[model samples]
Target: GRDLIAYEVKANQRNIEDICICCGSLQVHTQHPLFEGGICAPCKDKFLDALFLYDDDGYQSYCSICCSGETLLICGNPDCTRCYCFECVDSLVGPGTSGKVHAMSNWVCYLCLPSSRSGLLQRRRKWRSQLKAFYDRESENPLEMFETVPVWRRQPVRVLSLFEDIKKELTSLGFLESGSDPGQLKHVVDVTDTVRKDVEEWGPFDLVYGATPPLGHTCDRPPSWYLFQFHRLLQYARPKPGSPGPFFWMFVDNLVLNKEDLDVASRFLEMEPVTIPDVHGGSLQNAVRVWSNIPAIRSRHWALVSEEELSLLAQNKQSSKLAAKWPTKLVKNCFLPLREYFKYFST
Candidate 1:
């Protein structure tokens, strides 16, 4: 996303134009004088001081003698300044040098310097701490807590990416409108409360499937699944003849989405699953079966259908099955008949 350039230096004013300073190569940058110096900034400093004292003519002929007892000469490149010995230069300045100098070259003046490595490590640690602090501060904002987890941070980026595909699919099916209704979707107390509870219970999912982050201590997890379920329910909850109440959908949607948004905005938490008892307090197997069957209702577009119509459909199907195998199916179909009358609109 951002661009950065590293400069090299070279020697020999005449051959400088052809040499890269960093890697002592003929392919030097024609625009930057540093490239013609045949050495990088770090290396060039070493050679310049050596030549000033030993070679007054500015010629990098004899390799400069450093405290380390190594004789070094300017590499034949414009990008690297590290003076190299006969052996080092041959090893680092050939056609195979790849136009760059190795950091471990023994001929370099500061080859034995230890401060540079320690400074780099310190900077890295500081940067990481600064990043964490930034996230912690942003998450504490009240307004940000109102947004959905994906939309709270990264603003528009995560939101657009994660929902674009789902929105497009809904649009194709004539389920979604072009613009959102702020009045209907506005944040409310019930929604916020539900979201808080959900976040406290369930975990949030990542944008990329199966790439969940860690939920460290002091980090509140987002109610990602609860928000998703709320959104799914709202999509079919239009307050028409067969639809659920708009207010009901609105309340639940706000709670779940806000909790997730707040968690993301804060960056202090991750998402995980929340374990809870089913409404029926049924066996685990029964709960799972019911949950799995709910998807079939959604897929069949029965979520917005009238309860009476759903009952009729179930009864008619049961009658057809009974006719096919009346006596033998009677015992096995006992629950099926009772399920035929279960209220599909209760949830």
Candidate 2:
């Protein structure tokens, strides 16, 4: 009785005269390449190419959603290559999305759905034609182009210099940690809290960078308090003479990468730093100017200490002496501009 019911259900699973679900073409495979959708051979190949989200040597085999490879259900769309694990798919659309597709034996991804369609028969034709035309106009892959480059791009040097200058300001403000010496730091990582636990636990470094001084500041804290968190970043990243370069984990908000993506990013670390003038030229001066822009004083647009206080600070043997000894160019370029800005704000 069980065998009879199973046979009847299997028989009802597909049309008696088999046909491709896309384009109404005759099925090339007896069981269909997509199995339930009855997608023809050529359409199946297009789906693979469309979902080709990464380079072959990189994350090609991984799921497009969670970046995991386990138990993936490949999309049946002739114009999309996204593979989703059942868990990811279910979690995305709620628990029964993939299950219904599994039980019903047909799936057409929403990406390939026609904006306007008449009936089921015409819909398949529209989907197939639309995708074929869509593929014809594009030769390059966009996903690869977007993820391949760092957001810092041409200005990474300024960003790097800004980190150290912020740290120098923190040192002057008496926020130095006992073990915050640059000699011991081997790597730097963002404390964005968005990184996966698995990735965090498996990272190369033991002491990952966290937001220490914090992004928020109270009025009583020193002016540099808001920017001191980034100081930890420079401790690991700034290159020292005769030492091996450091590893870093940079996280941009809302950007998720699979293992393959990480592999591609790792290659960037081997690139040499851009050369600049030794005499604190446009590169370093621009860095100081940029760091000076942060709102360092309480709700005021600029960081400020009174002229008398600044003069007293310059004479201090312990704290502000270090600030006094900063490069002459930094003092001339940044401190002068900040003083000018604060003078304007006072009026």
What is the C-alpha lDDT profile of model 2 across 1-347, one tens digit per residue? 11222222245564512554432355533222221234456644544453323322222344543345564665554223345556544543344666765655456644345432211222223333333343343323221111111112211111222211334432232222334434222222332232334333333231122221211221353423323333334344433455432223221100112234323333332221111111233211111112111111111112332334333332342332233233323222122112111111111
Question: What's the number of clashes in each of the models?
Answer: 49, 2
Top lDDT: which candidate number?
A: 2
**How does each model score on TM-score?**
0.15, 0.19
As a whole number from 0 to 100, the lDDT of residue 174 in candidate 1 is 24
Candidate 1's residue-wise lDDT over 36-107, tens digit each? 133334443343333212222222334432111244445442212234443333332343232343443432
- C-alpha RMSD for every candidate: 26.8, 21.9
Compare the candidates by TM-score and give the number of the best one. 2
Worst 10 residues of 2 by lDDT: 338-347
Alpha carbon lDDT at 297, candidate 2: 13
Indicate the worst ten consecutive residues by lDDT in candidate 1: 286-295
**lDDT assessment of candidate 2:** 0.31
Tell me the spans in candidate 2 whose CA falls farther than 4 Å from its real position. 1-60, 104-106, 114-347
lDDT per model, in order?
Answer: 0.25, 0.31
